[PDB]
Amino acid sequence: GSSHHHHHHMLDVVKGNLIVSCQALSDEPLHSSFIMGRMAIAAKQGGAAAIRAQGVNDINEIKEVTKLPIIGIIARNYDDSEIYITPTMKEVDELLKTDCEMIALDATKRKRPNGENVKDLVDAIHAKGRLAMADISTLEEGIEAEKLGFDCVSTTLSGYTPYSKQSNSVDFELLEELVKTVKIPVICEGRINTPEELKKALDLGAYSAVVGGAITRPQQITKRFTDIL
Amino acid sequence: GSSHHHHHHMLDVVKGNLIVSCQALSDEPLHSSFIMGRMAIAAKQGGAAAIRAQGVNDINEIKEVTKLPIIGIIARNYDDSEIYITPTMKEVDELLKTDCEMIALDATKRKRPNGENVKDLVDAIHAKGRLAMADISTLEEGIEAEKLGFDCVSTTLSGYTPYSKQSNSVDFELLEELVKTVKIPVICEGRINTPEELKKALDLGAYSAVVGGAITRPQQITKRFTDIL
Ligand SMILES: CC(=O)N[C@H](C=O)[C@@H](O)[C@H](O)[C@H](O)COP(=O)(O)O
Ligand SMILES: CC(=O)N[C@H](C=O)[C@@H](O)[C@H](O)[C@H](O)COP(=O)(O)O
Ligand SMILES: [Cl-]
Ligand SMILES: [Cl-]
């Protein structure tokens, strides 16, 4: 098949710019597609180049009210896997019904629900002409993600798997190691709290970066204030 | 008249603690009492001791969903005054129909609408058993606020009047100078962006402090990130 050509392409749009993650799961105070939409508007008006969002309802609302490029995920627990970021083809298919341009998925070394294989997920995303982002936790996972044909890798899961670096701050070391090894874009994502950290990520060769909670989780932002008192 | 005695009193509750301002005016993406209530829940869950809020509808919603103490204001422009933070008795009366425990008002040296006198507003607040906060821009304004019977003074308007220090950062000097000179509590309010600045304000003798946009205005938080790129 064929389609009209667009002038702007998501990876070009986000290069050197900020992607804002606008998520609020069911146990979080801002949980509401309406609210996530308004948070994405705020992000757009503060200069965000793209949005990362969770679930079909939030993705569809954000797309409608901002018209920014979106990295879509579905976060879902399965009884037979530790993976929750877009774990199976079921989630991929659900996301492919939204207009999100990129789909991010856990691309860790771990077994997926139903014993599904990450390559099948990437291929399905590509079969619909969407981009795939590999959320990884280690250097080796990043290298493998490139081999599997992901369009980009993100450091999202560093510190969120038991075998990766345990840290409460941005994993710059993983970022540094990835950029000297893989050729595809490496996106810094996880625990960026300050502009100075964002700047550092880009200075170290991150293609782009994603900030979520330091912008869109006022509970977390509040806590970082109250923790100093 | 008489009333039930409470164990907790607002000034004791906020002493050494953080107050979070949850505001979104009509030109802002989060303008909605629903969203401000959710911001206030987030702030509560993150350790906030009290909330500062604007407008009856937001104040009532925040009180309903958090049960925290509230510093209420009404922001309203008048054609005959530069003052917009609770400028007249009309706004005081509107706020007294809510349960907010403290009312803040501009206590600058400037003429109010209808030639009203700030002392009359303070007295009307006290007559209903509420506390009054003086939002000021200069040291002399802070010194006069105490004389006028305010219960506390805040540095809210420093940098927001033509004759006060113009700055994009917290006015620590005004804070220190008020702490040298007035006996009533001095609240640091305005342009606190980082936990380190919050700590600094308390270390300088602020009784409490208010953080607004750095928690509850994602557009502003996002811009501070994108400005460094
Ligand atoms: C580990 C995991 O589930 N991360 C999720 C991925 O979408 C989100 O919870 C994060 O907010 C996002 O990755 C951005 O990170 P941060 O909020 O730290 O800036
Ligand atoms: C000048 C003025 O109208 N200040 C208002 C006072 O309520 C609010 O816009 C501020 O957000 C609030 O004072 C807290 O300050 P900051 O958002 O800088 O932390
Ligand atoms: Cl939150
Ligand atoms: Cl905002």
Domains and CATH numbers, chain B: 1-229 (3.20.20.70)
C-alpha B155/C-alpha B143 separation (Å) is: 12
In this structure, are residues A148 and A179 in contact, taking their beta carbons and an 8 Å threshold?
no
In this structure, are residues A187 and A209 in contact, taking their beta carbons and an 8 Å threshold?
yes
The token duo for A25 is 């799961």
C-alpha B209/C-alpha B20 separation (Å) is: 8
A225 to chain B, closest Cα gap in Å: 5
In this structure, are residues B144 and B162 in contact, taking their beta carbons and an 8 Å threshold?
no
The token duo for A186 is 């490496």
B191 vs A: CB within 8 A: no
C-alpha B134/C-alpha B151 separation (Å) is: 8
State the helix-helix crossing angle for A56-66 and A33-45, rounded to 10 degrees. Answer: 40
B198·A229 Cβ contact <8 A: yes
Q: What is the DSSP letter of B27?
A: T
B225·A215 Cβ contact <8 A: yes
Whose CA is closest to B89, among B59, B55, B124, B134? B124
Compare CB distances from A222 to B46, B221, B226 and report the shortest one's residue. Answer: B46
**Does the beta carbon of B198 lie inside 6 Å of ligand 2?**
no
A222 to chain B: closest CA residue: B46
A203 to chain B: closest CA residue: B229
Residue nearest atom 14 in ligand 1 by C-alpha distance: A212
Residues of B numbered 14-73 whose beta carbons fall under 8 angstroms of chain A's beta carbons: which are they? Answer: 16-18, 20, 28-30, 32, 34-35, 38-39, 41-43, 45-48
Say which amino acid occupies A56.
V
In this structure, are residues B91 and B113 in contact, taking their beta carbons and an 8 Å threshold?
no
Give strand pairing partners of A70.
A51
B222·A47 Cβ contact <8 A: yes
Compare CB distances from A29 to B20, B42, B222 and report the shortest one's residue. Answer: B42
C-alpha B167/C-alpha A117 separation (Å) is: 56
Chosen from B208, B222, B223, B224 to mutate, greatest number of chain A CBs within 10 A: B222
Q: How far are the Cα atoms of A69, B124, B141, B150 from residue B120, in angstroms, in the given order?
A: 54, 6, 17, 11
SS (H, E, C) chain A: CCCCCCCCCHHHHHCCCEEEECCCCCCCCCCCHHHHHHHHHHHHHCCCCEEEEECHHHHHHHHHHHCCCEEEECECCCCCCCCCECCCHHHHHHHHCCCCCEEEEECCCCCCHHHCCHHHHHHHHHHCCCEEEEECCCHHHHHHHHHCCCCEEECCCCCCCCCCCCCCCCCHHHHHHHHCCCCCCEEEECCCCCHHHHHHHHHCCCCEEEECHHHHCHHHHHHHHHHCC
For residue A214, the ligand 1 atom closest to its alpha carbon is: 19
Method for this entry:
X-ray
For residue B105, the CA-to-ligand 3 centroid distance in Å is: 29
Angle made by CA atoms B148, B149, B151, in degrees to the nearest 5: 130
Rounding to the nearest 10 degrees, give the CA dihedral for residues B98, B103, B106, B107: 140
The token duo for A158 is 């560093």
B222·A48 Cβ contact <8 A: yes
B7 vs A: CB within 8 A: no
A17·B221 Cβ contact <8 A: no
- Tally A–B CB contacts below 8 A: 133
As a whole number of angstroms, the longest Cα–Cα distance in chain A is 60
Query: How many CB atoms are closer than 10 A to CB B223?
Result: 18
A220·B46 Cβ contact <8 A: yes
C-alpha A121/C-alpha B124 separation (Å) is: 66
| Closest ligand to Cα B215 | 2
Residues of B in contact with A229 (CB under 8 A): 16-18, 198-199, 202
C-alpha A132/C-alpha A122 separation (Å) is: 6
Overall size of chain B counted in residues: 229
Tokens 């400028």, residue? B87
C-alpha B124/C-alpha A79 separation (Å) is: 61
For residue B218, the CA-to-ligand 4 centroid distance in Å is: 4
A221 vs B: CB within 8 A: yes
